[PDB]
Amino acid sequence: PIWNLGPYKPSQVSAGSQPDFYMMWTEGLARIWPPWEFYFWHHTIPAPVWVAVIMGLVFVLLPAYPFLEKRFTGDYAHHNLLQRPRDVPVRTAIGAMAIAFYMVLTLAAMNDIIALKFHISLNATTWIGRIGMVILPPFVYFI
Amino acid sequence: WSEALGIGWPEGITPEAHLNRELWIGAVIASLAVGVIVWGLIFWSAVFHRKKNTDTELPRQFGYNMPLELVLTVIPFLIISVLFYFTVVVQEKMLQIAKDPEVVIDITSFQWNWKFGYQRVNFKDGTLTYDGADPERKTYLNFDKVETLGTSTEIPVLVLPSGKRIEFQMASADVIHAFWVPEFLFKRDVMPNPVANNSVNVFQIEEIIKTGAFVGHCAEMCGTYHSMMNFEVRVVTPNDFKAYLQQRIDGKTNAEALRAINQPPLAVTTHPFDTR
């Protein structure tokens, strides 16, 4: 409801954030990243460069998966019949890996709404995400 | 000697307290005797019958002793009836509620601190006659001119004579509270509208034998700072109580009234908590 909003000006800002949910992972990754910086001779590389590196790596990995799997398993046979999900544990485990990572990244940037509707500390939820994207994945993978 | 048998109960300051302690001592003796009997029975069974030696087939398959069961189920009825009769008799003496109490004090309780009312004064000898009733009210609360009010940093103090009929009326502001005095050997809750809730807010004390200062605490869950609102009660001679009464009749604080009659200003048993 744009009419409820106002015209854009540089001096106006509020809790209005969290853009559309299909690119939301970039915002989540920006929110979660720790503040690491490097300083050498009259130069400075800020934290978001790591976010750009991670999103570029995600870009690269998506079309490169079939070649990676073919070289990893060494299979070069033709197939016209699919496999039911419960017959290939490794691929299903990697899929669970990826989907859990995406979900935890998505919900991490819901920090404002989560802390607002449910009375939870903002810092507490940030730390929950900060530990979650690293400790949760192996658990669901094994499960 | 009997203090150890009394399980640490503080010495009585009122005849009904002494009667209550006598009943408590008797009940404790009976309960200890019963427990010792059953403990000895269990020990004797577990020591001698335990001797399961290398030669045994089966001790006995017997499980029916109906007359003995009837005897052992009828025996406790006599003792429970005796103790119930004693309890009724004693508790009857606890609720005399005399029609003419000598001194009536209105207790005002609220969130995290107390308040005292000093409703009226009337002595049988005709030496003290005064009413502190205040029509200041225009709602169930009671208001008086001379009133003792406490503070988070000042321990509330109650001044009371010795050997007099004393009455207290409960009145609370927001939540449940329990006026307790360990030396009184008595406890009672305080309700917002006891009349509207059909509960008795009136209890009386015949007299106090000893004098001095005593500690008190509340005995319910009344919020967060429940344990930092203790209060002290001081028992003085009738002449000293009278002198303090007319001293507080004129504009004077608790410390000034207590100091002017050769008494410590603050509470001796209790001290304020710094972190609050």
């Binding site: 106002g6 509020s14 809790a15 559309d20 920090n111 802390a115 607002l116 | 609220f110 988070s152």
Partner: protein, 213 residues
């Protein structure tokens, strides 16, 4: 007259936290000297009364609140109607544009674009503006409660206050022309509704149309 009644009503329960003469216990609460009856009125009528402090029902009802406010004043005064009551319609403004601009420049930052709840850090938050009335919000912005940037009457014109009043009353209460309201947040509730309804019916209709084997 009213001063004695207000003092008695306060001393019934106020001394337990602040002080008999409004002194201020060092580790319990403030001193309550500079603030006027506006602070007491806002903190009493709204319902952030003694707690163990979110919204709650008030204890006093429009009768002794004025008495305790006058008692506090004797030791920022509310705006009252000429007949003796609290103002309720005279505080409404006329110029909505300035009110909206000031809302987006100073109000919307913490609460929301449409005035709903806002998210802060480490516990406390921004409540929704719906359950508050004109007198309450005016005395609140004039008072500066906890975690509030208090506003002086010199820096903000009284016309600015009435324009803010009108804008906040119009924005929250008016029916949305877009149909059902999704909480007034961004696109996160929209995506949640998408996941819960949108493709759920789609996959149900696909299962109905298609066969399984």
């Amino acid at each position: 007259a009213l001063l004695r009644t207000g003092k008695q009503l306060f001393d019934t329960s106020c001394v337990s936290c602040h002080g008999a003469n409004l002194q201020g216990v060092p580790d319990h609460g403030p001193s309550l000297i500079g603030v006027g009856e506006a602070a007491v009125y806002f903190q009493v009528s709204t319902g952030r009364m003694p707690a163990m402090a979110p919204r709650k029902d008030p204890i006093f009802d429009e009768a002794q609140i004025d008495a305790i406010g006058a008692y506090v004043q004797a030791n920022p005064t509310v705006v009252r109607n000429p007949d003796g009551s609290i103002a309720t319609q005279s505080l409404r403004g006329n110029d909505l544009g300035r009110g909206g601009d000031l809302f987006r420049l100073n109000c919307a930052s913490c609460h929301n674009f449409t005035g709903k709840g806002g998210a802060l850090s480490s516990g406390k938050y921004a409540p929704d503006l719906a359950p508050a009335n004109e007198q309450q919000i005016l005395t609140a912005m004039l008072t500066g409660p906890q975690n509030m940037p208090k506003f002086s009457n010199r820096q903000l014109s009284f016309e600015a206050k009435k324009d803010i009043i009108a804008y906040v009353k119009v924005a929250t209460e008016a029916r949305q022309p877009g149909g059902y309201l999704l909480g007034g947040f961004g696109p996160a509730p929209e995506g949640m509704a998408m996941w819960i309804i949108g493709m759920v019916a789609a996959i149900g209709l696909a299962l109905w149309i298609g066969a399984r084997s």
